Amino acid sequence: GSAQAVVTQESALTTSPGETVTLTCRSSTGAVISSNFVSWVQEKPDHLFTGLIGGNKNRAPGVPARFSGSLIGDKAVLTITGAQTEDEAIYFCALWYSNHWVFGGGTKLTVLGQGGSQVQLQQPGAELAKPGASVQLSCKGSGYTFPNYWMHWVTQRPGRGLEWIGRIDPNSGFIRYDERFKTKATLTVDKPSSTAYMQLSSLTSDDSAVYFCARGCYGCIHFDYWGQGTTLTVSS
Ligand SMILES: O=C(O)CCCCCNC(=O)Cc1cc([N+](=O)O)c(O)c([N+](=O)O)c1
Numbered sequence: 408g409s410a411q412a413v414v415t416q417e418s419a420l421t422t423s424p425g426e427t428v429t430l431t432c433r434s435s436t437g438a439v440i441s442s443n444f445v446s447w448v449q450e451k452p453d454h455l456f457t458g459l460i461g462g463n464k465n466r467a468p469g470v471p472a473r474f475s476g477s478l479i480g481d482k483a484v485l486t487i488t489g490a491q492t493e494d495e496a497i498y499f500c501a502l503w504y505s506n507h508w509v510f511g512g513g514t515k516l517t518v519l520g521q522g523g524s525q526v527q528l529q530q531p532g533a534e535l536a537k538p539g540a541s542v543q544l545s546c547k548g549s550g551y552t553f554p555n556y557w558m559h560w561v562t563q564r565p566g567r568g569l570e571w572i573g574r575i576d577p578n579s580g581f582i583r584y585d586e587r588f589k590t591k592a593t594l595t596v597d598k599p600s601s602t603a604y605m606q607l608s609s610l611t612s613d614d615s616a617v618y619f620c621a622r623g624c625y626g627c628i629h630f631d632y633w634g635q636g637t638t639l640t641v642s643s
Contacts, residue, residue: 446461464476
């Protein structure tokens with residue numbers, strides 16, 4: 408059974424500078440295992456995502472050393488050893504399940520005591536389209552070798568969590584769609600302009616959301632770098 412695969416995280420945690428924080432990530436299918444190749448990502452205001460950990464335990468370059476990831480017993484764990492005020496954020500884990508990624512629901516971390524990037528993924532800020540129509544979203548990679556990375560697409564509906572849409576390999580053309588989005592999204596890419604595209608079809612008000620692109624590749628820190636997100640509003 409994996410058609411109901413659900414990833415669970417703590418609702419909220421509170422810390423302060425110099426404390427240790429433990430965040431966990433559990434799978435409904437059994438123990439979290441090495442094959443789940445877990446990523447941890449951080450959401451700051453407004454819709455600003457950064458990948459912290461990939462491949463269960465690999466810290467992304469540039470991420471502070473106080474962040475570490477591991478598989479401990481049957482869960483994935485992100486530890487912040489010596490929290491800082493800038494760590495106040497929502498933390499999501501993501502698990503690989505055979506042919507799709509599943510995000511956990513996120514943990515809101517509060518830190519008491521409050522008070523350019525080489526790689527860039529470039530998305531337009533906003534789009535509006537009518538119900539029943541389709542729309543094109545774009546994501547241009549800058550400052551890295553675009554064909555050497557897959558492009559993931561992810562959405563966040565208002566007030567809610569992350570949902571994986573699919574990914575495309577620019578080098579081979581291979582596409583994966585999540586079952587949730589295989590009739591909603593269509594992925595294409597253009598290598599000479601380093602641009603990934605996603606067409607969203609048969610729009611409805613449920614499709615009003617922020618849509619992100621993010622990098623990945625086999626064995627890489629999936630979701631290391633993210634576009635800023637395009638806000639789509641579906642309205643007459
Ligand atoms: O221990 C070590 O480093 C050696 C083992 C490295 C395992 C790396 N796994 C992934 O990168 C996860 C993943 C695999 C895929 N696959 O295998 O087809 C995908 O297609 C896919 N995706 O996003 O679509 C994602």
